[PDB]
Design a protein around this nucleic acid. Structure first.
Length: 10
DNA sequence: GAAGCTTC
DNA sequence: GAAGCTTC
């Protein structure tokens, strides 16, 4: 997830 | 070494 | 079913 906690996605 | 899925 | 990286 995030940054932070890619995206989602990529 | 963990805690955190939504682009197709 | 990848799969893109960070904040702790």
């Amino acid at each position: 997830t995030x940054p932070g906690v890619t995206x989602p996605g990529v």
